[PDB]
Design a protein around this ligand. Sequence first.
Ligand SMILES: Cn1c(SCC(=O)O)nc2c(=O)[nH]c(N)nc21
Length: 266
Amino acid sequence: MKLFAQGTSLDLSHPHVMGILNVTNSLIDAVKHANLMINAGATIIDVGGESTRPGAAEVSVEEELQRVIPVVEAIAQRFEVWISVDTSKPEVIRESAKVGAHIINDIRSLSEPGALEAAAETGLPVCLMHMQGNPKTMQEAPKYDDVFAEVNRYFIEQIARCEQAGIAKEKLLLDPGFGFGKNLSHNYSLLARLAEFHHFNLPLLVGMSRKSMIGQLLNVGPSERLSGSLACAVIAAMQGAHIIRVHDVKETVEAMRVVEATLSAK
Ligand SMILES: Cn1c(SCC(=O)O)nc2c(=O)[nH]c(N)nc21
């Protein structure tokens, strides 16, 4: 199982670590941070210029472009590392793809006007992430009769939706979107059953690093969540998750090596 973008490949026979690069000189700090994460073992750098927090004061297209496009550009013309962009906006999708982005990672699964078509036209791999509702309001009262089933259903529908717009099944990644319209129980239900999302035969991407599913369980703030975060990463990778999105790269890469050695021996 592989992915193809910008004339190179990503080999998903083992877990990859995705380093979070939040951009909210700005440009000099970001490149350094991307460098430190590449050295630490990160093979994808995730550039994100719009807060996805439950607060959610949305940003303009011009400001998202200002924050994201120079950073993606800088990274693609130094390093060989794959680059993913956290955007919902078709112009950011178009523009970051031109300057060398490899993966469109949209928390809204290309639901914005023109986003689906803009993604189609780039030919780049697209991540389909589940969220109930939208960021402004998703956390007030998350509710499912059956969270696994509803997330499963969501991937069926979105995979079709992307196929119909001319994006090949081979381009898609799936992500049940931990913390995106989910309480603590919902999140752990999805993590315990994550291996069952393999039936789609698509790479699974997951993102639990320092999230409330650790914070609420341990009753600690965001800087005290590393052990819980590594536990979540290992639990997911043991179930065959292909990409782990994290803040703490060195520690996550160390944990993934232990998982790789374990899965080799099976
Ligand atoms: C942008 N983005 C965030 S932002 C919130 C945070 O970093 O806590 N979380 C995720 C995630 O879980 N999956 C994917 N695919 N993208 C994500």
